[PDB]
Amino acid sequence: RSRKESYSVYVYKVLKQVHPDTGISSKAMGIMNSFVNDIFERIAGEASRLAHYNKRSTITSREIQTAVRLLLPGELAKHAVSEGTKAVTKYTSS
Amino acid sequence: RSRKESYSVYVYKVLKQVHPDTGISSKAMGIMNSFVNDIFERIAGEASRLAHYNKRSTITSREIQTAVRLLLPGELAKHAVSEGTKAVTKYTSS
Amino acid sequence: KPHRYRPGTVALREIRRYQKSTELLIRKLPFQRLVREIAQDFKTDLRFQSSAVMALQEASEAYLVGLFEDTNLCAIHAKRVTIMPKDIQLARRIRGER
Amino acid sequence: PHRYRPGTVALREIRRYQKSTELLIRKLPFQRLVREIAQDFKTDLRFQSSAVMALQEASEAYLVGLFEDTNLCAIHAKRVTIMPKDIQLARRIRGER
Amino acid sequence: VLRDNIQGITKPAIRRLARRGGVKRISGLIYEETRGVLKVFLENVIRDAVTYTEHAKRKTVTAMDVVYALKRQGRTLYGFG
Amino acid sequence: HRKVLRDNIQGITKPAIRRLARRGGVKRISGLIYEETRGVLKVFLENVIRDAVTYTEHAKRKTVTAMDVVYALKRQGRTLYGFGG
Amino acid sequence: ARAKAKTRSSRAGLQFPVGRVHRLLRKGNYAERVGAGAPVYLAAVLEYLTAEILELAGNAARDNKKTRIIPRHLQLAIRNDEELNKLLGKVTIAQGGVLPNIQAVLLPK
Amino acid sequence: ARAKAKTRSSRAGLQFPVGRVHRLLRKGNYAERVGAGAPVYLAAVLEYLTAEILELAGNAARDNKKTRIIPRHLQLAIRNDEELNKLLGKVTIAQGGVLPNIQAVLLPK
Amino acid sequence: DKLKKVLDKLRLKRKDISEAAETVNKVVERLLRRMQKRESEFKGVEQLNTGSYYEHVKISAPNEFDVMFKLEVPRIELQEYYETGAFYLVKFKRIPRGNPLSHFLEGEVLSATKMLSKFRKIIKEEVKEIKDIDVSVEKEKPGSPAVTLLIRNPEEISVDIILALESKGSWPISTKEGLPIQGWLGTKVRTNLRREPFYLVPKNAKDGNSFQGETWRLSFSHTEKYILNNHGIEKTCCESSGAKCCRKECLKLMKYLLEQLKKEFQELDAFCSYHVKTAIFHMWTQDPQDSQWDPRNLSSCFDKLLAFFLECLRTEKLDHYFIPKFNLFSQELIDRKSKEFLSKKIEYERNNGFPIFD
DNA sequence: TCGAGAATCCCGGTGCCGAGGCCGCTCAATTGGTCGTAGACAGCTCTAGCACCGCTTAAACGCACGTACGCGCTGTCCCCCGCGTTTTAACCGCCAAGGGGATTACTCCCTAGTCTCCAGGCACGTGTCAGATATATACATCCGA
DNA sequence: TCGGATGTATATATCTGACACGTGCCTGGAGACTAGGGAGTAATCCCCTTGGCGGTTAAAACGCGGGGGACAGCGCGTACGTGCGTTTAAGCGGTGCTAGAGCTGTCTACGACCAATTGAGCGGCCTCGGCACCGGGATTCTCGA
Ligand SMILES: [Zn+2]
User: Fold this and answer.
1) CB contact under 8 A, G67 and B36
2) Domains in chain A, start-ordered, CATH in brackets?
3) How far apart are the CA of I295 and the centre of ligand 1, in A?
């Protein structure tokens, strides 16, 4: 039997940090799964088009940062950019 | 000096078969060039997404045919499909 | 003498009730029959998974509700409270669907 | 004196301007406006000319479309003039606010 | 075969759909137009879904097909796959 | 001569708005359309130019080439034909 | 001994190139491997559409006694049809003008 | 002797996986070669956005005394904001309902 | 001389035909009104004016007339039939609304048989309603596409009605080198003429059963009329403030010569006035100057035309003026022995003072 | 400004079925090296954007007049709401049959990758014809009497 | 209904610059060949779609009386169209500078690829408590006198 992959466990883990006693019904799991897939698709597609305009042939962090700066409206851009930079720095340090 | 590629000559050739005595000004050449690029982009992108939904990994004529059947509205679909099939048959015969 | 609300009150009570629930508002079986009828014209002997019919129903409900919101705006714009077909046709024309 | 009745020169001007194809906004004021707006996002920017032309063409097309839809609302509400309520309604229906 | 099913969208159903929208006094000529608009919308979506299924060489229009047909026209639907 | 600028939105004169309206097929323009039109134009221009400048900044340049503006427009469903592509 | 070169556009009886389209398909990251029948089909479709636009524009240009084609004629050709206008319902054409149109109520009695 | 395994999500201090995102990027035909820094950034952004939605929905759910989360709460959380409502301005949520809203002129005098 | 007397007689002939021509125009105009009132697919039909004077019309008996009814059709496609483009096939391109002629199709091609059948039927119905003048429709003649009216008021007049399609598209590519008057009337006039529609008239080829009733030939009656009436390098040529030439007089003399020979010798059945008009078009191109056509020198100009025609006879080659590859003097259209016969007749007439004009 | 009534909120008790956790286990992620190219960086050239000056004149600005349209007020009558009673078909529960989706094996031919070689297409230069412009008409349209 | 006034379409004559066409050359497309993995085809399993029966009560359908909202008509006033006279600054032609876009040439580091190993996550169970539903009471909001 072929057997599939989703984002249920990760979303549940993230939920258990900002509301330590609530649950979530399977319909909401489906909605959150689809939402994650859609955002990932949009960001990756934008990054690909950017990398192709400048005749480059690779995806560095910088294209992802510019794509995020283009899609998310308003102050969400600032906050997400800061989060990404902090994470990548903490990863490269070790 | 780097030196670029366009669709000027081909559009001019096609024009010389349906109006054997008219010309075309450079602005119209720019417009037709951009239009060809845009249609090619739309059709190729649709074909790629189709080939990826079914877990395939290649682009045959059949995906291009389905993409054309999806984009072009109305009877344009019928006429373009017939043209494509005739051309591919005449090519495969030899 | 029997008790009777003046015209224009049960309307607001029902607006307040319906804007608050979530279940569907179109009977299942008639919609299933309509979908099969329409699909008859493009191919013969098709089979629909149930969830597909559910998806079609949800999409249609959402589209119609949006259309009526915009129509109501157009109607109130012209010193009225009653919607008429010219309002719907104007809304669809402006929105770019025609 | 040969005054035309009100509502004639307007129809003549429609019949003329719906036929030509040049640009209707003066150039230098638009260039100055574009640079003024651009200064906030980044300082000391240099524009090619064709970029300014492209911006102008897009702006003209957008405004013309908006006025057409506004006129449609104004006729629908039993009038002939257009007033800001019309424009706000059109932009709210199109989904931009 | 089937015939005369568009009359399945009754008049009270349209009244309820309007009430959810925020309308107070519906006239008497709305129904004959709402039915037509709904018919057009369903025709478009179902045509795209059937094209997808025909391409994939199947006889069962699955939910993913309808979701893709909807997403094509810019009406994304979250909650089925 | 890096002279900053101020109050150039008044440069979109009144007859320009009038002519733009006439091309659209209108017949009587009230006296308060002008402010609304200027506001709308300002909003639209801001939205386009922000994305154009981001596209430029990504490539380490100081010249906002027209092809960038074409991309910025295309991203909002306003594809423009006639300026390179 | 190699046989004489014979371009693929010749063997297909088309006008748009086929080698160029094949290269663009391969180096654009659309799929891992491009079949050998796709480019012919795609070139045929593109040629047909360009033929449509050019023929209609040429008719409209000969209408008012002009030899060449200028963007106004392209806008006139596109905006009058019923399908082409639906395929290009979002596209602005530089220096295109608009269609002559005056509402019915504005005209004087 | 091989050192003990240590997942990349651990070394980055995230929650969403990074290996899975890297695989999806490589086998989706987005570009020829994916740098080694992209997946971390992308996972961080996704985690932040999901955190936003879940926190707002949780507040709205605790509002009316319910332990779990159901699609109505997600619709309430999304439709009230000013930026999230603009990022998802085209998306229909199944079984979502609408926002309570009655116009001002309909209400009786 | 005899030639001027012949011209006088030819001119005096218009009086004997004028009243019949007027009755014909009356009937035709009634028919056109009838066809335009009724709701059918032929509602837009109109008369094409092709000229009624002796110079414009084909050789005919004095009480026989021909008229062309033109019809409008959207966006046709022409497929060549021969190598010279003597015949054309008609097909249809994309139409958004739907082809109003859909039910006249046979496969991909428009069937001339069906269109003429409906045309004839409609004509019969409308002609039955003409009550004041006895007009009926002659029994269809197999092999002739015309619908022939018989008018009895009280003498019998025949009117062949030929349906003609009209197309506003580009002129066919074959005609690219046609109309070579760039040096005769200037380039701008050539362009203005080429910016006009063209006509298609049904004609079967003589090439077997296949495609019979599905072939059409081109008609340029409008350009030829225009050139005939505006034929000078000087704008005032043959005008009230200009000078006459003998171009049309020469045309009339040669046409009447051919008419009389064809009457005397039925061996000459395959020759027609179009050969004469083509020849004289070539002469008008070769000798563009009005002074090369002074009326004083009419007979000499006619003789120089005769010599060219004899050489045309001898080489069996006469290119269509609009379609250069279309050889009007091909072996298949006119037997070599008929041309040798005509050569002998022409030499006889030229050496004996044209007794056939007597 | 008040009674009377009808609809909604609050609340206490019961039953169940769906969310939450546990246990195998297997297949994808990690660790460890190798290498061949793409991107980084320095250095140079030359196009194109910016800044300035004088002027010729087309478009913008400002003011007066008055006419047509926006807006408010009244009257009227017919269409849509609210409610009661009857009639129809949606729903739910339970079977029963079988077309078709999904998975496994295997084998072959179509596409990727290389190497060579030669012509199609691009940069450049040139000469003349189509279109822009100026001027004088000839005709179509609006407005008061 | 008409004549006068104004505005627009037409024909003629003249310049000028851009486009249609040659020309030389170069690099990428075609020809010939080889290898191997994706996809096509056949066979088997089982699940989930269609089809039907039968009872139950919720909702649709029909009809009736009347309060109120759409619509037409009228009257009034200000505000925006039209035209004339005046003042501002936009094009435009032409210099003159130099910042930076774009290109060429080395050279290092890093992502793909391959091979072995092992633990995170998925599918399949169980289990109990969060919620739906019932039924009774209290609260509140609308209408007529
Ligand atoms: Zn003459």
Assistant:
1) no
2) 1-94 (1.10.20.10)
3) 10
